Amino acid sequence: DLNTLVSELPEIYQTIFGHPEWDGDAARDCNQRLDLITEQYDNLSRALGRPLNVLDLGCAQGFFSLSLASKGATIVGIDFQQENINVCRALAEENPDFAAEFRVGRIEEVIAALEEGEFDLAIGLSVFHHIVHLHGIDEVKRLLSRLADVTQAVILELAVKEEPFYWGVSQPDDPRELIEQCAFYRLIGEFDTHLSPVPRPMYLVSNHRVLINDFNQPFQHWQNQPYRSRRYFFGEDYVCKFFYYDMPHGILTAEESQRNKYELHNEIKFLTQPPAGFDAPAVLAHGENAQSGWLVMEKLPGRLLSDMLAAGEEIDREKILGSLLRSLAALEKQGFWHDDVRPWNVMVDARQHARLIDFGSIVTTPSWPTNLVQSFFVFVNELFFNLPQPWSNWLYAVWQEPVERWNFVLLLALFEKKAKLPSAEQQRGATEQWIIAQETVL
Amino acid sequence: DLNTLVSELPEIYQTIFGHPEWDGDAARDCNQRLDLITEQYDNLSRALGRPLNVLDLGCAQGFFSLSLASKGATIVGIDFQQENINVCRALAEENPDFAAEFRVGRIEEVIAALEEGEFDLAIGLSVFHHIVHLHGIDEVKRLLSRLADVTQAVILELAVKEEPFYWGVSQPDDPRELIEQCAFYRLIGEFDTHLSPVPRPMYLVSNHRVLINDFNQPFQHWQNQPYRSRRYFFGEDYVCKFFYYDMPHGILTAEESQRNKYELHNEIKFLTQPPAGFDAPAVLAHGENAQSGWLVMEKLPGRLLSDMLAAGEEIDREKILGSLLRSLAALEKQGFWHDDVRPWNVMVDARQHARLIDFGSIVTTPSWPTNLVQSFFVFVNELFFNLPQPWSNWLYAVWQEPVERWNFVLLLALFEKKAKLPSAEQQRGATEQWIIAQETVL
Ligand SMILES: C[S@@+](CC[C@H](N)C(=O)[O-])C[C@H]1O[C@@H](n2cnc3c(N)ncnc32)[C@H](O)[C@@H]1O
Ligand SMILES: C[S@@+](CC[C@H](N)C(=O)[O-])C[C@H]1O[C@@H](n2cnc3c(N)ncnc32)[C@H](O)[C@@H]1O
Ligand SMILES: Nc1ncnc2c1ncn2[C@@H]1O[C@H](COP(=O)(O)O)[C@@H](O)[C@H]1O
Ligand SMILES: Nc1ncnc2c1ncn2[C@@H]1O[C@H](COP(=O)(O)O)[C@@H](O)[C@H]1O
Ligand SMILES: [Cl-]
Ligand SMILES: [Cl-]
Ligand SMILES: [Cl-]
């Protein structure tokens, strides 16, 4: 009888599915976690076009497992306590059409035995802290990596060191240390455990998909360090830029988080409303919240200029500078400038034409834009002290201009006629050269 | 200069690619491992239809990496010694068309950072024993699992405890303990290290493909325990049965290995030359060697009978027994019998028709086949002491037959007319019942 099986539970941790007579006894009601988990189930089931195979690690009394089988999922629940699995099976038998199996076993051994494709979604709620406590953080990171490797999505509720109990002392400094080796992760909620006032965060993690409520797609590779608060995911015709505003440990000062926030926000604003006369990459999706923000854009051909420079690849500096200057002059005509023209913000296509790819540093108002013209000289010099004729003649001409006349329209016009300009080395000069060489050091 | 870089190597472990003046100095010539690795490169490149991305872990002086880049591979080599990477890079620069990159780094951190699809083939030759020695066997198993998870194939040369040095003591009992958690593995050679007379085995490992020289295909799931010396891999229209004759530890006695060998051999012989009047599954590939044997067959629909029995699924015992008896009678007419008719050797399709799926126990000559008819009664009883009318009447009729008349043609004929046979419970009987009930216990 169910009555007996429930009584023999060491703890009624969860609601007993279909049996509200124990709801008052359950440590956690599970309705809040279930609301969120069913939303994510539906998103992923919609994306894949079918009901999911779900793995429930430390499934306890089966509530999540049965609740998803109720919606058509095929589920396997694992728990190392016989008493818990006895209840899960007795509940499944009351619901014979649910495709639900339960097994006694250890999460560590199950994860080692998993095969990729067997399960689409795994859930691990409030269980990994027990594995941390007995086996340490590094083994848990590897288990969670494998779990992500073999599924399409993982949902974790993770206990945290701020919880007031003795086992909190063995927890990592931040729960994100258990998952940050995985490719994609997002905080999706925080839940009251009824053990204390400290809530547990729930994360959605994937090694195969971008999972954003509006955009759910496989990616084939990703990157953290460009050229660690920013991650880039590459799919067939998209790049998803994912910025963390909220990072663990020291990592971001207040100012840096706000700048992550500012840049991504500014980039979204510009790209959703670009200026006429400028070909901006197209925007497929975007959003922001307290922890992070994201932007999914069309994927552009080419390589990042700084990589080409680092990997000593052959470059046409004329075509790169010409094309970039042309786009900068067109921006300026529409009252836009870019505050940070550097090799890692420039992409060069197969025909050696260049374009900006980060619009975080775009600005709309201001003497000016004289400073930006100055840095652009450094850019030029780093792209190559190092300027042969007629690049040097170009710069010398700019330097002879009154400063109120410095702007990107002028820079471009002089650049186009640089072969006609007088020879800098024939003049006393000589300072423009030394100031940028010191700048280009500085 | 290369001269200087080579001199500064703590050890010239490998041949210096393109520079035979150091071949006499190299600890290992590498030509034997390279012959085998290039063969496996070609097989996998042929299967995938393209040049491969290859990862070389602990790449030392770059010999394998450069030698594969020479054949069109794109390679990344990793080593934690700066001196080694300096030589690798200097060699790559002598061969500018090779797509070869090298990085200083630790194998543990690289594996954690890998993404699935980035590399098709990883090689790890004589390097993991260093990671075992510092981090232990369990962490190395997890690293190797992840390596297999993220690639299509892995080639490992593994040091072994029989090597006479002090670090041998930290090695596992058998090198297969580092890899047996991976889905597919095969010994492909054994190599002289020049440190001692003990050779190191080279394994080909995969978590995604069956990699047999004649048959190279993805699989989507696999299984060890049927219903651990036998593994089954399932692909789109095939099942590959892989039997180990050579197993680690105690696992197989001499007799058991020979029986693995005998069964698989016998199954290959039968299926490649099946008897007329019997629909045998078709054979796609097969082979045997000292360590193991394999058989790739067409994949049959249905479920294994023993699973259906265990998972209490609905079965039609009439249709199952009828169909099986019909095929057993047709075998017998061609002078073939099956020595081991049990639920785990029988597959039942959607229309409840049954067939044998393991032909290891097929035999061709012998009083006989009286023992087999007897077991078939146990089979019958386990499929349900437990026999209602008219199954009991069937068995009673058989038992009244002189023993020289017991055979599967008779069993089938009586089975088809069982509704007409006299009622066993009306007779003294009663023993046939008790002998099989004791047999069915026994
Ligand atoms: C605190 S409860 C969480 C239950 C459930 N996941 C939930 O959040 O509603 C932890 C559960 O995991 C199980 N468990 C703990 N460590 C385990 C392990 N190493 N393998 C399998 N089950 C484990 C316990 O038996 C218990 O049912
Ligand atoms: C015995 S040698 C084998 C070299 C090469 N794989 C071969 O078999 O021809 C081991 C190599 O691995 C490197 N190595 C050892 N442990 C390493 C680690 N943890 N990460 C990166 N490289 C490592 C050593 O620097 C050395 O080059
Ligand atoms: N729209 C895009 N299309 C292609 N690559 C991009 C795009 N946006 C960013 N990247 C790439 O993102 C990587 C590193 O991030 P980032 O700082 O954006 O350059 C570089 O390799 C860029 O080429
Ligand atoms: N030709 C085949 N087609 C489909 N399944 C097979 C075939 N051969 C073996 N199996 C399956 O292999 C699994 C376990 O191995 P076995 O002992 O061969 O039954 C069972 O689930 C069988 O259904
Ligand atoms: Cl946890
Ligand atoms: Cl580990
Ligand atoms: Cl090794």
Curated annotation (Swiss-Prot), chains A, B:
Free-text function comment from the UniProt entry: Regulates the length of the LPS O-antigen polysaccharide chain. Stops the polymerization of the chain by phosphorylating and then methylating the phosphate on the terminal sugar. This terminal modification is essential for export of the O-antigen across the inner membrane. WbdD is also required for correct localization of the WbdA mannosyltransferase.
Positions of ATP binding: 226, 230-232, 241, 263, 298-300, 347, 358
Native species: Escherichia coli
Domain of life: Bacteria
Family, similarity comment: Belongs to the WbdD family.
Protein name: O-antigen chain terminator bifunctional methyltransferase/kinase WbdD
Protein topology in the membrane: Peripheral membrane protein
Record has Zinc as a keyword: no
GO biological process: methylation; O antigen biosynthetic process
Residues reported to bind S-adenosyl-L-methionine: 13-14, 33, 58, 79-84, 105-108, 125
